[PDB]
Write an enzyme that holds these catalytic residues in place. Structure first.
Site, PDB file in Angstrom:
ATOM      1  N   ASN A 154      23.090  21.885 -16.377  1.00  0.00           N
ATOM      2  CA  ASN A 154      22.521  22.148 -15.054  1.00  0.00           C
ATOM      3  C   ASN A 154      21.241  22.965 -15.257  1.00  0.00           C
ATOM      4  O   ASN A 154      20.243  22.782 -14.562  1.00  0.00           O
ATOM      5  CB  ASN A 154      23.508  22.969 -14.211  1.00  0.00           C
ATOM      6  N   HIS A 202     -12.831   5.377  17.343  1.00  0.00           N
ATOM      7  CA  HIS A 202     -12.274   4.108  17.815  1.00  0.00           C
ATOM      8  C   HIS A 202     -13.131   3.013  17.147  1.00  0.00           C
ATOM      9  O   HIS A 202     -13.400   1.984  17.761  1.00  0.00           O
ATOM     10  CB  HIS A 202     -12.424   3.976  19.345  1.00  0.00           C
ATOM     11  N   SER A 238     -14.816 -14.041  -6.221  1.00  0.00           N
ATOM     12  CA  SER A 238     -14.758 -15.457  -6.608  1.00  0.00           C
ATOM     13  C   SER A 238     -16.015 -15.917  -7.356  1.00  0.00           C
ATOM     14  O   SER A 238     -17.087 -15.333  -7.200  1.00  0.00           O
ATOM     15  CB  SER A 238     -14.554 -16.325  -5.357  1.00  0.00           C
TER      16      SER A 238
END
EC number: 4.3.2.1
Lengths: 448, 449, 448, 449
Positions: free
Chosen positions: B99, B145, B266
């Site tokens: 422990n 926002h 890509s």
């Protein structure tokens, strides 16, 4: 120039390894569907099909050699295919997208895994069921607030969990029907531009149905969350059961003793069984819940279609799977070998718990609730003065408080008769217990 | 029906190994105190210390070998020692319990790790603050926002992230102090029974203090939890930046673009640049978070003292530790080498963003707020009806809505003059940003340590 | 505007409790406006008087909320304007609801964390006084919920007191970072009129001012931080609650709760239910849910203000009220629970000394393993004869090891067992005394 | 009992909602009580009179909030006596608070899931409809928030409506497991009065009957389960909110919200803040917070009843209220948002057709690897030529691959682009229609709740 440490986030090679089998199966099914589109000639297909198989064995026999350039399985494999069959492999990717395979291999791996989980869950439930039907005689206290409430049947208890797990079974199968929907053929996010036979792909891989929207199948991970949920719930049930056994295996309770195999001890203190198996199983609940907690946050607020974020799912699925597998098998072994103590459980049944039934006596005879309740209050009252177990009073003492008390009251002081009152459906009455054992025995047939 | 599987959970050799060194560190620290207690002769000690040093080197050179019998590190470590020194090794296990080693090994490991994370974290802020100083003149739109609000300075934005991270550094410092408390000497529940010198132990392993109550020290994992909390917030902090730059790196925005080393793309669309790096980082917020929730659950409702459930902390800590490390370095890299489109940022600013400044122009001329709001509101509409931007309105056009509008109403329509109004502490004014950079420099050195 | 959207971003229900602080802040700003020229001496005074009357209305509960009132900011602005007219309008110059949201919530929190602090201390202080009085009491120490070894009842209480004290530390650290004034950060770019934030920080009694307007207007670390701390504190109370419940069972019999914090029926008087401890244990999850929610609200959010941020209030308010009650209810339970010495005393058994015996060998130069091996035979032998370790003859011992003198009889004395642990933080009488002092000092320092 | 403790259970405010469901739960038990031979017909009808009176109290809103009572069980228990004298008491017999508590909630939730099921469907249907109406609108498909390839705005709405369908299916499975009467299971061991639970079922309109008294009392799966479904639903919505929020930006300019579901300023009439979608996104955490909290409450509990199980009502009550409001604002937002066919158009670029071009070759016979390479050449050429992939002439294309014919011009058409994907689930006009029909159908099967 890709940053080395940057790869440390998207290079789960070790993890990727266990998706190799499913990758091959998808490539194959795909290749076969490819020839059906003319993008492959019967000849090529065979060459491709062959190379894939030699790879499968290389994985099965664990002889597949991994490389550094290898990022994912998709790369580790394709590199290997070209190593075998050669540059003819470049065709297999025609019209296909890493975004398709990633989710295709995952739903596959999952479908199989759940199958193993289910088996164990059912075998776990079954074990409970049989053990119950055996020890239908054993009776012990029913706990509420962890305080002796009323005499309940041991089997009634065992089954309580068994019924809570079978619901987990019902939820598990349901998650399976949604996992068994082939995503292959959704492309990078718009679908397959070669007009391939998605249906042919379905049956090839034994999927139930086919996806409906490409953009969706590419980004959705509901199949991961939904799984983690059923998992997490399952672990809650299993944790509550561990809490009971751990507590019952306590000296202070002495109701039962886990097997050495599923417990820990010491040579200095032989009479000391540590519920190691139970505890671990109890802790794995947070380990699972944690996985669910994670993924749920990974998906929250993510913009549409594929995002590298969707990569965090693999490690989550494997963890829970391996954890459920074991946690379930260990639950069975703890239940199957743990030995109870009929003496202790019945010795734990004190008359105070019968005070309730006493009120049931007056009411069955006609007397209202309040009048039967207060009538028991007075009963335990003078039973304290005399300092004698409530069962050992006077037939007059009873009729002294309320007339309706007769010689029948003698029965009220019995556990069996106490447990046999709940004959209703669901109650701890032996007849009800058998009904349950029949209910579950049946359910375990339909899901087979 | 699984005993050997029962052993598969409570087992983690692959992970236990991360604690080889720390474990040996405490065995040595303990052995020394054992000798000071008489349990070990000067000669017995020297051998145990010689053994421990050999196992330390064996692990280092990755030349250590574990057997299929080795449960955890403690078991795999006393097995090798007994194999080196022989039956003499037993003396070491005198008095102390597992422990004890558990919390002593994790606290030691964490100490070193936090120190690393701390250093990496300081490199982010430094990278941020530093660039904030090199690009102080760049101006862009400030959102709310995700809608353009008003002209703000690029440095301001950067510094806002740096500030939130500073608090992270601070929280970590705190976690570390409670972590710098020696638990070794708590036995398995009631303490060391040999009256071992706890102080000498605190000294050897170099800990600030010593565990106060044995029952607690052995059964507590606040240090684990608290660390995962700090880590989770740090991550949310970073998920908010990943989000910011990801958007600012889209072609739709065009404010900046990552370097090839922290992105992908890509072959056919060489203009497409995917911010993988940022995606990965943001996603780790959930990963870490998961671990925090995980452990939290584990502790919840747990009875007093040790319980095998506490064995779930190792993997949680390790995961988050490696995660924060990688993420923080990749974080710094990105902010370090990404390109800024000073052109597009300055191009996103519009005259409409100055409508507020126009109202303010009137408030400085002694006009009441509410009255100036409406005055600026009519100038907007009028310009809208004429189909032109408010900055192109005629001084006469303005005077029609209010005679107060004087010729000097033109300084309002200047994005530089605009940001220049917020000179108050924290503002986006060149002055305010400079002082902020001075503060951080002092905090980065205040933190340090 | 929509009626349903308003049913998420318009809650005077919960918002009303920020009426006070909102007023205290508008006053401070008014003051700084006057010094900046926006307001005139004679105007400010008109504003303060009216602003103060709005406070009296709320504290009295006479304040009338219009149907067009969305946030406390609008309600209070509305009132002020109808109370003073146009003048009140100038009060908004250069300010925004954005910087008012954080300033209010932080002020509210400042006091709230204070009220929580004093309660958390009274609980700790309460736990320590009992560890003082009941310092001689001794019961079993548990591991895996099994009897490991003797320990002082006070060592138990102190372990919880020591962990509850680490919380107080954490609490004060959170409070320090909350004690920073966001007011003067504008809508996101800071104050445009060059308001003197120093005067503001001083007027509201804040420790310092915010560094970055953007960060100040959009960050919620003070909310998350408060939540992490609260959660870890409930966890501490959840582990302690667990201990108490199990201890309050008729099986353990270690102690029972006072009637004030329990429930029961007149039919089973010897059965009390720890509602108090149970409610407290459940609140750990209640609070954790709140931590998790806010963590997810912040994840992936783009810079500066966003409506998503308005979920913090309800979360804060809930925890603040939950900790407020939980701490007190806990304090009570602890200072009023009746403990049974005898029961804890009878829980102590010989087998629990086998370790103390092996130690008795070690102190005589006997090695670790050999001693452990000895004690084994010592326990095994008394196990074959049908007696307890403390009742086997001295010659019996000597057969296992010639080192067993006659002082072994000391080993078999529970008090000797505890006193064994005098090494700092152990369970020996002195150690417990020491702990008490340390915790008493900690609380002394942490008073300002 | 301490009043402070009272503030951790006493909450008529929250209890009240179960008022009516409790009255019916009673009306059912009473009737059953009679057939058991505990209540005479005269008593029964009598009691049934008080209940029907009380269910009208709160109903119209006349009931008196007993400043001394807490739960509704006691409030109603009381008020009944205040109407049918002491007889009301006998309405308990054999029952248990550990029964009504669960019975009252499943019923509540049951009536709730049904209402929720409606709003959700109205949303899915709103998405499907709008998609089927703008099947022609084409815009950019995103990946890593960078332009990936041409895609139909309908194919977008549908992917959301499709995921939402799984929420509707999951909510369906939930509602079923919940439609199982727990009544008649006693406080722990079942009903001793051998009452007819079948009568109760038929009476309360359930579908099945709990199989185990102990389970029915201690289990809270319906709470947890329902909480999980709502959370997965919210994640979906938050994802949708994120897109529409990002799309509603100036930079993107793809669409605009209606004034009803937005927020703005008289200063910046353009700038439209999407409060409706932000509030919807935040509710994910809120909801998740309930799921999380109740998971921790149940985790590790000891068998049968524990006061701990009292936190359910507030979580369920909250989530339900949220799902209702959110779902409706969603349906509102979508159906009223104004789309910019134009901007979505200009967003389509030639570079996005480099892949289509490669595919052109693939069909003509050329293998993938080559087609790709041949396409990159066409890109590089255009680069060094100062034009776009579509301005390269036939000879230019020929000089890269003989295969390129005069039909290759058909590749540079964003409509034809999306028409390639006709395979099941693709974005081809036809595929989209099919989808629209699949869902109209699937919604029908879900409408038959």
């Amino acid at each position: 120039s890709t940053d080395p440490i940057m790869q440390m986030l998207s290079t789960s090679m070790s993890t990727e390894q266990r998706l190799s089998e499913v990758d091959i199966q998808a490539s194959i099914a795909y290749a076969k569907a490819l020839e059906k589109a003319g993008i492959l000639t019967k000849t090529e297909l065979e060459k491709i099909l062959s190379g894939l198989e030699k790879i499968s064995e290389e994985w099965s026999k664990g002889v597949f050699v991994v490389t550094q350039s290898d990022e994912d399985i998709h790369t580790a494999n394709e590199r290997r295919l070209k190593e075998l069959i050669g540059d003819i492999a470049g065709k297999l990717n025609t019209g296909r997208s890493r975004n398709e395979q990633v989710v295709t291999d995952l739903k596959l791996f999952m479908k199989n895994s759940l199958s193993v989980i289910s088996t164990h869950l059912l075998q776990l439930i079954k074990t409970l069921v049989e053990r119950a039907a055996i020890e239908i005689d054993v009776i012990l206290p029913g706990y509420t607030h962890l305080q002796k409430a009323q005499p309940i049947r041991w089997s009634q208890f065992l089954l309580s969990h068994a019924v809570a797990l079978t619901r987990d079974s019902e939820r598990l199968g349901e998650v399976k029907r949604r996992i068994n929907v082939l995503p292959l053929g959704s492309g990078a996010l718009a679908g397959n531009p070669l007009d391939i036979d998605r249906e042919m792909l379905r049956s090839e891989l034994d999927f139930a149905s086919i996806s409906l929207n490409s953009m969706d199948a590419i980004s959705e991970r509901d199949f991961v969350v939904e799984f983690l949920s059923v998992a997490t719930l399952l672990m809650i049930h299993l944790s509550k059961m561990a809490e009971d056994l751990i507590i019952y295996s306590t000296s202070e309770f002495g109701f039962l003793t886990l097997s050495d195999a599923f417990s820990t001890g010491s040579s200095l203190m032989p009479q000391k069984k540590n519920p190691d198996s139970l505890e671990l199983i109890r802790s794995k609940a947070g380990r699972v819940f944690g996985r669910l907690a994670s993924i749920l946050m990974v998906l929250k607020g993510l913009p549409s279609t594929y995002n590298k974020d969707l990569q965090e799912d693999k490690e989550a699925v494997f963890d829970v799977v391996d954890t459920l597998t074991a946690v379930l098998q260990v639950a069975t072994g703890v239940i199957s070998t743990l030995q109870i103590s009929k003496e202790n459980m019945e010795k734990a049944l004190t008359p105070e718990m019968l005070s309730t039934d006493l009120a049931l006596y007056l009411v069955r005879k006609g007397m209202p609730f309040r009048q039967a309740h207060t009538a028991s209050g007075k009963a335990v009252h003078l039973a304290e003065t005399k300092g004698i177990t409530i069962n050992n009073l006077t037939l007059e003492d009873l009729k002294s408080i309320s007339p309706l008390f007769s010689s029948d009251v003698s029965q009220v002081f019995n556990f069996v008769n106490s447990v046999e009152q709940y004959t209703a459906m669901g109650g701890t009455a032996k007849s009800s217990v058998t009904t349950q054992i029949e209910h579950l025995r049946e359910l375990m047939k339909k899901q087979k």
